[PDB]
Amino acid sequence: EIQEIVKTGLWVGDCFIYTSSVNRLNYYVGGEIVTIAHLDRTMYLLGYIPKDNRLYLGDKELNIVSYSLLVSVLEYQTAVMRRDFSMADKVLPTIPKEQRTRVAHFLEKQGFKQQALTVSTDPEHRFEL
Amino acid sequence: MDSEPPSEISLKNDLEKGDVKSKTEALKKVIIMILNGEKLPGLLMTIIRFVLPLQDHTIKKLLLVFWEIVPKTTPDGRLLHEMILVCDAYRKDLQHPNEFIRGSTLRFLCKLKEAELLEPLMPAIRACLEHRHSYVRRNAVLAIYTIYRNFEHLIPDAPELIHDFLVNEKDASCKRNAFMMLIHADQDRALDYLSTCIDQVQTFGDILQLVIVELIYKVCHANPSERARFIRCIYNLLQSSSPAVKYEAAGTLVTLSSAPTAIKAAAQCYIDLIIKESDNNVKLIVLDRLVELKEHPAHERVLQDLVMDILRVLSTPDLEVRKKTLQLALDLVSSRNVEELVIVLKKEVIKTNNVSEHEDTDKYRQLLVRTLHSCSVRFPDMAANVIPVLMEFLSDSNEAAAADVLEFVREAIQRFDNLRMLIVEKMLEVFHAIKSVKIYRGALWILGEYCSTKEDIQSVMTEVRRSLGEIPIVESEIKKEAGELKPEEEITVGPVQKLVTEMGTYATQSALSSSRPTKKEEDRPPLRGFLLDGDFFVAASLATTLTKIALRYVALVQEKKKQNSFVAEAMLLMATILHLGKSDPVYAEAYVHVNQYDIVLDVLVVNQTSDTLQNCTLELATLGDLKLVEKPSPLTLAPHDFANIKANVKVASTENGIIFGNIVYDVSGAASDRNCVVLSDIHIDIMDYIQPATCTDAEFRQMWAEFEWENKVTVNTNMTDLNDYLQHILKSTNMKCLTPEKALSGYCGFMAANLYARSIFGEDALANVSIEKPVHQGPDAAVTGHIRIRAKSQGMALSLGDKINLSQKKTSL
């Protein structure tokens, strides 16, 4: 059961990307809820059109807004969920600063403090691990 | 009867009259005069007589009212007994079938901590043991607790009477309505019972259970009370880097600044903090959490930066919110402050792009050029951005608009040596339409330093040199400037050498060159031509000449410490500068004594006379800001009496209507014309009345400006520094030596103190004590100090002026 409520949602693979009533775009992996991104306003998932390389959102308007799904983050975290911590580390060169620390914290929550230590950019997170 | 202290004779009459309304009104009038604090015992027998047994609630309620605010004091109609006229027939009142009279009676009776009513209040819990309302049961737990408080911490108040004696507190927990007067010192079993009650709550009652016993294992269980404790409990379980995202704190918090812009400004601050925790350099201060709203994905839709743009402000919302917002742009994003300040400054500073950011008032324009430019001086990357934007500033092409632009950029070149070669050609352009000083000054400096780069210069300079506008300060700036950089690298009909010729003529010489200069006579008296005239050893060439000076920057020039800088964005700074950050014969003999830190005025009162002075009373008075902490109290001053009587003294009070002199001391005795005489004990001054307060350099400076302090005296025995005599004496005329206004060196080094006080005289008091202690071969007057003084109409200025000399008193009786 997932913490952030699903106002609307979409399945990208077996991973569920949904909007939340917090305006949070989160994805469900593992039975764990991660925030892929923050929505600034209330948005609904029209669908994911591979052509545009985008997820198409709409406001109150019958027009288009687009969010590309942050696949590198999602794949890091998904791999972590599966208990493929090394695999998620291959993703890490393309996870930036603070995101490596976060993804590391994901890795850690699932378990393996050390692999999380190598990816975490932040020294403090390394130091605690 | 709002407050009328003499009316007690009419009240007695009104109190019994055979008309119930009149009696009620009378008793009511007594209540209102006592509450204010006025005369009441005369009436007592009358008051007490009608009301006593009756179940008729209104008079009874009124009398019941008067027994909790003065019962002890009033004694005509009551006197002292165990079953007083407060409670004797109010045992009937307690035992009436109507809940209101019983309830009321119980409630006042048990409320008193009176010992002359201790017994009657104890079985007074009977009146509310049966609970006809929520009010009756609450009234009971509070009354048992009040009985417990009133000398019954043991077995008189603890068990049950027939249902409560300290057990309503237990009962309340399981009953339909709760309220626990059990906060301290009461039954353990009830405390335990309240815990059980957290679940089976009554909400008002829950606030009573909760003050006693807090922290839950749950999320909640319901109701505002539990909810209010809960945010406290949450802050515990995550203290770390503020709350960050405010919990249930948010609801009270808005009202905390209802006046009206300040809430948004505050809210904006939290929202900025929350975004991210950055590097936290100089004005990069965003705390809270590192990731919780990120910054800056390239797939995030419609992005974080949209909210970040609000914070970049010209005033885009209103001024209070503006000042907060500019700091807040700087705080989330920059390198320090420099990066986001350049962007922000680019928007604010004057252009040809938008005319909603340009203005024809010269100082503001200039300041805005300096703010943009200070970012370069701070950080390199900004130099490259600044120079092309500066040329856009110029493109406005008003005399003045060019002018301001030229003035900063020229400073930037002093910092930024042969890096801004490119700008010179742009800078000349608007130099020809001219009505001001500033344009000439600045242009002549760019065109002058930059000569190697260009070759135009006779042509550009010459239209201006034979044009008019305002030219004082033009002279100074052109004087050091015109030749510079490379000896022969220009030519239009005047090479660099013609320029040195010109440069010299403009400074103070004479020469046909650029169709003569506009003026020659220099700016402010000290500057003159001569230094530069001597100079240009090697004709306008980088060596040890004007060029050197021009392509170098005076002292250290780095940061935003205000060394070729101006410290952020010019509009935000005005607000920061504003912020001061202020923090019958009678004989007396007397001395002041202190034992065990008790300060007392010793007085001895002497009757050297054989005559009668009986009727002798001694008083110390409250004059104004002087006060008695206890007058001398002996009934002494009798035939050939010597007595020592101690009058305790205070220095701090509020002004009384009687005289304002030294210390008044009053002895009374026999005599009927001068029953009271005023005679003196030793000196206390007018100066006491001043109240000490302090200033910082900003408050001192503001007040200096605010009102004149020209007035000076020189005070002897200011030979010494600030710290010694001068501080101690200044203290006694309630002043204090704070911050400096000095400028010390090997030739300078008068000690300077900035003084402040805020006198209870309708004035402040300020002064500067300058101590002329020789740090030169020719001192003012040697050791001594001149105190420059003021007060707000300089009526206390004078107090400062002489109370920094000397001051001492002693006696040895």
Swiss-Prot record, chain A:
For this UniProt entry, which residues form the secretion signal?
A: none
Explain the consequences of disrupting this gene.
Answer: The knockout of the gene results in early embryonic lethality with no viable embryos recovered at 12.5 dpc.
Q: Where in the cell is it found?
A: Cytoplasm, Cytosol; Golgi apparatus membrane; Cytoplasmic vesicle, COPI-coated vesicle membrane
Residue list for modification N6-acetyllysine: 109
**Family stated for the protein in its record:** Belongs to the WD repeat COPB2 family.
Assembly notes = Oligomeric complex that consists of at least the alpha, beta, beta', gamma, delta, epsilon and zeta subunits. Probably interacts with PEX11A. Interacts with SCYL1. Interacts with JAGN1.
What is the stated purpose of this protein? Answer: The coatomer is a cytosolic protein complex that binds to dilysine motifs and reversibly associates with Golgi non-clathrin-coated vesicles, which further mediate biosynthetic protein transport from the ER, via the Golgi up to the trans Golgi network. Coatomer complex is required for budding from Golgi membranes, and is essential for the retrograde Golgi-to-ER transport of dilysine-tagged proteins.
What is the protein name for this chain? Coatomer subunit beta'
Q: Which residues of the full protein are shown?
A: 519 to 647 of 905
From Swiss-Prot, chain B:
Report the subcellular localization: Cytoplasm; Golgi apparatus membrane; Cytoplasmic vesicle, COPI-coated vesicle membrane; Cell membrane
Q: Which residues carry this modification: N6-acetyllysine?
A: 479
**UniProt main location, coarse:** cytoplasm
UniProt GO molecular function: structural molecule activity
A Pfam family found in this protein is Coatomer_b_Cpla
Q: Please, which domain of life does this record's source organism belong to?
A: Eukaryota
The record's account of tissue expression is: Predominantly expressed in the upper one-third of the oxyntic mucosa and in most regions of the pyloric mucosa. Ubiquitously expressed including platelet, liver, heart, spleen, lung and kidney.
Instruction: Spell out the disulfide connections.
Output: none
Q: How is it modified after translation?
A: Proteolytically cleaved between Ser-513 and Ser-514 by CAPN8.
Q: Which SUPFAM superfamilies match?
A: ARM repeat (SSF48371)
**What is the additional note?**
Brefeldin A induces dissociation from the Golgi of the beta-COP and presumably the other coatomer subunits.
What this protein is called in its record is Coatomer subunit beta
Q: Which organism is it from?
A: Mus musculus (Mouse)
